[PDB]
């Protein structure tokens, strides 16, 4: 009764802390790609 | 041109993910390892956690992983077998931890069914605690299975 | 499909003086398929009985502890603490942890079965029964029922009391490991801290670049 | 027409004993007439040892002294052991059982005798049946057994609970005065159903012989700069040790809060009897008002109205 | 070498008594030497019942009885007694109890403080520790325990077999006053190869704030009667209970049968006197001879030597 | 119980914050990425 709805309310934050860490990763490889391709190409 | 074009960060990103999901395998491994292995529990419940797969599956993927975001730099031009070939193995190192998975899935589901009460003792509740941990890997080790198998395509495609 | 494992006592109550004779008995279902030993841990350490019925002749100090049986083909039963003393008068218990609407057994016993007559037991330092001889086991616990008790009776005629003994009557809060349900919450914080400091760095390479990309 | 004296001997501490012995012994029946036989459970006796010895010669009357010998079991059990003459075609018999037990399931039983100053000048005895140690209220009987004089008084029951889990259970019976003076018996018997048998308690004015009280009062030798004054009132040479105390000086009767009397003990050998001391102790607000003090008594050996007063005068 | 045989009646219920009728038979006292006396469990009873008449009379050997009345209460209580018959200067014991339904009431420990008589005025406190009940003196384990390790100690140990089938095991701790007057706990340890854990008690000294008593002496409260006379010692407001009285006659101390201290009892006022008094009974000649008298209370409170002496005299 | 259910609170504003700061992100650089074409 009570122990299941934290458990589900646990495992939806993990699933969502997981997709925005993928997300975040790949802002950040895609942010680093763009400035070293904007350096290399301006210097 | 499709994937040939697509991979020119999907590789790194995926790379990245799978130093992330090797992280957080680590951190079950070790937290489960420290709290979870008492004698007084049975060994069936806690079949990941008894031939060494989370230490040897972690240590594979982030190996694997720092391989393909060392050869993402083009350093030397020659770590890119090395990681095709990590991966690979790593491909079979994944298959290996879902029927690991499954198998503790469902003896915690045998467990469970055997359990009245829902957690009346400390048995049923590390049993919830171990099925819990057993959802959360399974889902990590889909997302490394998908990063594996997508980066030894693309790093087949390229080697031929 | 495999079962649960049951430990049962003989006298059912968990504590014992010293010399006393108890046979811990495990029948969970083992008779799925032809007859089979069994396996007993006690301070984790594998003692070598393997029989249904284990036989403690003579009970010693160094007895008490965790007890766990287990079938083969089954899982481990449910631990039983055995605690053994050796004072005047004791106050055995059928269990030391009660869920609510539950029952359990109390009984005031003297040293070496010697007769024991006009018994007031005491909840919290305070009388709740007055037994002559019969014992108190107690139907329907609630909440109230928790605290520490403690019987007072006289071995032959000489006044004598038993010691403390603390029974917790609660809900189907067992607990031990919450502190790991923690760990959804926590692991995702380090996650999200993580993320944090990932979008700080992002945000201060995205204005570094937009002044070299400007 | 015989005289009966049944006699079970002892079950002695210092050696073993498993052979309870019992004796009858019959005085007064006629001379080379006996037929003495025991009776247990109303069934006739079976072990061989029936001796039938003369005691000694009384002329054409003669005493015979009857002779068995038992194990614990068969006393154990609480039987109806008689020993039966058939003298003259009449069955002469005596009956003896072994006593039940005090707190036979750990009640104990108190029956405190009526307080002389109720019985004596107040008028309105009561014996207060005080049994302790119970479990509950079910099916708890307190009967009074009024002997001789079986009269139409009933009786008053109720309920106490502490804190012990052990119920208390009062009886208060009405009694005449007249009746305490005579000695007639009166009895509580309590009866539960886990009980074997239910239990009987009696007692009536100490026997013995009756000795009048002699009250004596001392002055406050308290040094009167002082604040508080004590007044001591002895009793001397009353028996039996039941005695009422009290003290109505000036006028109305001072309460149960400036009092103390001393627990009743035994002289010192020569005349058979007690002495008590009385302390009242007042402050000086109440002293030095010219008022009186008198150390008024209550004992049955006294004259009608059994009071005497012992009085002093602040003055 | 006469023979002793001792018998008792055991309820008549039907009818109030409220009596048990102890019978001892002596056969073959030597004429005009029975001395039959009657004891219970080493408490000797004073009450003038004794009732000793000649059954049978042969010329060298003949025959005698003497009977007691008991309380059924003090029969019920598993009390034992005993006639003891003194003849050609040696004693025979013939025992009686209502033998036990149940094993030997267990075993019990008493601790006794010194009392304050030998604590402040002859210094000699010696603690008692007194184990009653004990099968046999068999590998019994009597071990002190003090605060303060002052060596010395030496206490002793000495049993003494009762006839009530059980053995008595007392010691004797001499310790100094100074301790106990300071305040140090003692503690007694008995242990004996049959017991879960060993017994221990404790005694100290009683906490509170200490009193100091006031006595007061009072005049012959009896007129010119001969027979005897009665002097009274009051003793008030004093903190604890542990305290000795004792009467001194011209200097010489008077023994302790005389004299009868009453228990303490609780004093109403707020300041727990604990208030008690003291008799004396003084017979004519003594009055007479012009004999002066002096209350010698003892009291811990009291600054040195402990001792508060009030004079009493005759003219 | 009342324990997580504060941390799901707390955690819930946390990822909504982080969403939208990412999304606000993620729009400028598309802006930027379309201005370099
Ligand atoms: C739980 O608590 C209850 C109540 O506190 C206990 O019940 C008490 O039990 C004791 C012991 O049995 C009782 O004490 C006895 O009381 C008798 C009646 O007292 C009445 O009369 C006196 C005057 O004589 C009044 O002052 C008093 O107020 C009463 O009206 C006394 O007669 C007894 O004394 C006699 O026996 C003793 C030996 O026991 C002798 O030494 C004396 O000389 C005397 O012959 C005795 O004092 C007490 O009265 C009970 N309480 C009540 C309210 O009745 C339970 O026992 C306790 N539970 C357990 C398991 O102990
Ligand atoms: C077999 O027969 C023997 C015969 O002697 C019995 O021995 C006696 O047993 C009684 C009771 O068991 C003892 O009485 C107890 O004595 C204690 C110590 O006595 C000393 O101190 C008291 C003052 O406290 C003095 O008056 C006395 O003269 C001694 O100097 C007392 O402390 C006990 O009182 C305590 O208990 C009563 C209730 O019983 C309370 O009301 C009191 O307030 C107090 O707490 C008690 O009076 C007696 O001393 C024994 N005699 C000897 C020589 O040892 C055996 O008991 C008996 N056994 C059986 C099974 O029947
Ligand atoms: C396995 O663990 C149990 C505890 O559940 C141990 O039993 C405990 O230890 C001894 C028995 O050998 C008992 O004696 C007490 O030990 C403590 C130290 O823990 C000491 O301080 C006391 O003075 C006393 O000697 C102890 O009571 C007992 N625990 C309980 C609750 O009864 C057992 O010994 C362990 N196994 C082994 C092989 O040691
Ligand atoms: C097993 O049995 C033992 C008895 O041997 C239990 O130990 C007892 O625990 C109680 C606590 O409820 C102790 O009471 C407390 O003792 C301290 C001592 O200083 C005192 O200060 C407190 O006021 C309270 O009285 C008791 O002393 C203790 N007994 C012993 C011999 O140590 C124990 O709890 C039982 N259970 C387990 C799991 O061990
Ligand atoms: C335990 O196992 C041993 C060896 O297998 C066997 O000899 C013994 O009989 C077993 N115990 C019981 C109670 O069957
Ligand atoms: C006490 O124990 C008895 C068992 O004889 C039980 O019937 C009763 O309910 C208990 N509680 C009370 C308050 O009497
Ligand atoms: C439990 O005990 C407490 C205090 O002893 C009391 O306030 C409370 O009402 C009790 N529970 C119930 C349900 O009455
Ligand atoms: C009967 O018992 C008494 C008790 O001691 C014994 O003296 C007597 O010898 C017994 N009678 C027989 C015939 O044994
Ligand atoms: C006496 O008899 C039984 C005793 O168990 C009781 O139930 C009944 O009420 C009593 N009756 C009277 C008249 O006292
Ligand atoms: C005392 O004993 C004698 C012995 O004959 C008896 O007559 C008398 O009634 C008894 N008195 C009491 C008060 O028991
Ligand atoms: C008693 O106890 C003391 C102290 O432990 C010990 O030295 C002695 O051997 C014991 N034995 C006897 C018989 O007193």
Redesign the interface.
């Known amino acids: 009764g009570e122990p299941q709805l934290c458990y589900i309310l646990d495992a939806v934050l993990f699933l969502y802390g997981i997709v925005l860490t993928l997300l975040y990763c790949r802002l950040k490889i895609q942010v680093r790609k763009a400035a070293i391709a904007s350096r290399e190409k301006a210097d | 041109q499709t994937w040939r074009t697509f991979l ?2 999907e590789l ?2 995926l790379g ?2 799978q130093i ?1 999901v090797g992280l ?1 395998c680590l ?1 079950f491994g070790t ?1 489960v390892c420290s ?2 292995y ?5 060994e ?2 806690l079949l990941l956690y008894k031939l060494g797969y989370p230490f040897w599956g972690a240590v594979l993927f982030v190996l694997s992983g720092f391989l393909s975001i060392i050869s993402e730099r083009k350093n030397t031009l020659y770590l890119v077998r090395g990681s095709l070939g990590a991966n690979i193995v790593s491909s079979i190192a994944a298959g290996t931890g879902i029927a690991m998975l499954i198998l503790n899935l469902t003896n915690n589901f ?2 469970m ?3 009245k ?7 049923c ?2 049993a ?2 171990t099925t ?1 941990l057993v ?2 890997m399974l ?2 080790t889909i ?1 490394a299975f998908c990063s594996a198998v997508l980066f030894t395509i693309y790093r087949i495609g390229q080697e031929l | 499909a495999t079962e649960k494992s049951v430990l049962t006592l003989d006298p059912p109550w968990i504590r014992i003086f010293t010399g006393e004779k108890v046979t811990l008995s495990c029948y969970g279902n083992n008779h799925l398929q032809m007859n089979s030993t069994t396996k007993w841990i006690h301070n984790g350490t594998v003692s070598e009985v393997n029989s249904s019925h284990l036989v403690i002749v003579s009970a010693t100090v160094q007895d008490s502890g965790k007890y766990i049986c287990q079938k083969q083909g089954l899982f481990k039963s449910k631990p039983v603490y055995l605690n053994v003393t050796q004072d005047w008068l004791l106050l055995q218990t059928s269990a030391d942890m009660v869920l609510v609407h539950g029952s359990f057994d109390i009984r005031c016993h003297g040293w070496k079965n010697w007769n024991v007559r006009k018994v007031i037991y005491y909840r919290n330092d305070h009388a709740f029964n007055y037994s002559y001889e019969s014992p108190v086991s107690i139907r329907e616990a609630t909440l109230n029922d928790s605290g520490t008790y403690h019987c007072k009776g006289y071995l032959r005629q000489v006044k004598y009391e038993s010691d403390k003994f603390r029974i917790a009557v609660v809900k189907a809060y067992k607990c031990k490991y919450y502190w790991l349900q923690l760990i959804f919450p926590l692991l995702v914080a380090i996650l999200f801290a993580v993320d944090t400091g990932l979008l700080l760095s992002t945000e201060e390479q995205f204005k570094s670049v937009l002044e070299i990309q400007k | 027409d015989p005289t009966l004296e049944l006699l079970h001997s002892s079950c002695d501490p210092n050696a073993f004993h498993s052979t309870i012995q019992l004796y009858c012994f019959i005085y007064g029946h006629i001379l080379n007439d006996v037929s003495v036989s025991w009776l247990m459970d109303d069934r006739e006796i079976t072990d061989t040892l029936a001796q039938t010895v003369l005691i000694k010669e009384e002329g054409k009357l003669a005493s015979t002294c009857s002779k068995l010998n038992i194990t614990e079991q068969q006393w154990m059990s609480e039987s109806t052991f008689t020993c039966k003459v058939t003298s003259q075609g009449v069955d002469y018999l005596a009956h003896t059982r072994r006593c039940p037990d005090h707190e036979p399931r750990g009640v104990i039983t108190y029956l405190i005798p009526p307080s002389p100053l109720d019985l004596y000048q107040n008028g309105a005895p009561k014996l207060t049946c005080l049994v302790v140690d119970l479990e509950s209220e079910k099916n708890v009987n307190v009967t009074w057994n009024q002997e001789k004089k079986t009269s139409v008084s009933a009786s008053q029951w109720y309920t106490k609970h502490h804190n012990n889990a052990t119920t208390s259970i009062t009886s208060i019976l009405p009694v005449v005065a007249k009746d305490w003076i005579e000695g007639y018996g009166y009895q509580c018997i309590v009866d539960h159903p886990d009980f074997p048998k239910p239990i009987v308690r009696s007692i009536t004015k100490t026997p013995g012989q009756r000795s009048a009280p002699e009250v004596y009062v001392f002055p406050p030798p308290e040094e009167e700069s002082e604040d508080k004054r004590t007044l001591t009132c002895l009793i001397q040479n009353f028996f039996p040790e039941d005695i009422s105390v009290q003290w109505l000086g000036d006028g109305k009767l001072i309460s149960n809060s400036q009092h103390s009397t001393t627990t009743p003990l035994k002289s010192n050998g020569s005349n058979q009897g007690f002495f008590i001391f009385s302390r009242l102790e007042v402050a000086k607000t109440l002293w030095t008002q010219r008022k009186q003090f008198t150390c008024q008594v209550i004992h049955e050996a006294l004259q009608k109205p059994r009071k005497l007063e012992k009085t002093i005068s602040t003055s």
């Open positions: 020119k960060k790194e990103f990245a993910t992330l957080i951190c937290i709290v979870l008492v004698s007084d529990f049975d069936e419940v045998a467990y069914n055997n359990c009460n829902v957690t009346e003792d400390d048995g509740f590390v919830s605690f819990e959802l959360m889902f990590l997302l």
